[PDB]
Amino acid sequence: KFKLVFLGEQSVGKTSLITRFMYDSFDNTYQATIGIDFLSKTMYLEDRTVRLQLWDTAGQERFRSLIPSYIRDSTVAVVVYDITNLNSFQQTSKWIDDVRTERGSDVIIMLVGNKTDLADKRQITIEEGEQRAKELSVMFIETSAKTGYNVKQLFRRVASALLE
């Protein structure tokens, strides 16, 4: 049950993160997700292999009613925000709240501050994200689907958490 569901407001980088991990590519052009896609891939870690299942959800508000079914079903929830967007960060509380209401203590949550490459328009410090994650008892990491920074680390840490 290495099932990961990506949650987060529109345009924070959920699809880009999944695509960077899956095919190690990045398209700077925006193409909104209008359904729910799933992919899978086998990765290596801690002297073994693990089969991951990834769910990419639509962040636009008109698709929110389609998301609960996927949360109930996943063992890991990756809540993503955009470090250049204050609202996207504030909204992570809603997503984390939703996940815990549906999964309780039986879930691994990773808070992700994406788009670190956009340093000049950063609105949330890495320390504020790390502090929020600690206060809410969830994992934390910053990434850049564009440069690929920490993308493999994100999945490695989530997979490691599952194994433990």
Ligand X SMILES: Nc1nc2c(ncn2[C@@H]2O[C@H](COP(=O)(O)OP(=O)(O)OP(O)(O)=S)[C@@H](O)[C@H]2O)c(=O)[nH]1
Q: Which is nearer to ligand X, 133 or 145 (CB)?
A: 145
CA distances from 115 to 25, 45, 118, 137 (A): 15, 25, 6, 23
Q: Which is nearer to Mg ion, 34 or 86 (CB)?
A: 34
Q: Which stretch binds Mg ion (CB under 5 A): 1-9, 25-33, 117-125, 144-152?
A: 25-33
Name the residue whose CB lies closest to ligand X.
Answer: 59
Q: Which is nearer to ligand X, 79 or 159 (CB)?
A: 79
- The response to whether 92 counts as a known ligand-binding position is no
CA-to-CA distance for 79 and 97, rounded, in angstroms? 11
Minimum gap (Å) between residue 33 Cβ and ligand X:
3
Measured at the alpha carbon of residue 50, what is the angle toward residues 106 and 94, in degrees to the nearest 5? 35
Token digits of residue 23: 């095919």
Q: Which is nearer to ligand X, 28 or 105 (CB)?
A: 28
Partners of residue 143 on adjacent β-strands: 114
| Cβ–Cβ under 8 Å, residues 102 and 129 | no
Residue of 1, 30, 35, 106 interacting with ligand X (CB under 6 A): 30
Contact between 10 and ligand X by CB under 6 A: the answer reads yes
Token digits of residue 19: 């695509």
CA-to-CA distance for 113 and 58, rounded, in angstroms? 18
Q: Which residues bind ligand X (CB under 6 A)?
A: 8, 10-16, 28-30, 32-33, 58-60, 114-115, 117-118, 144-146
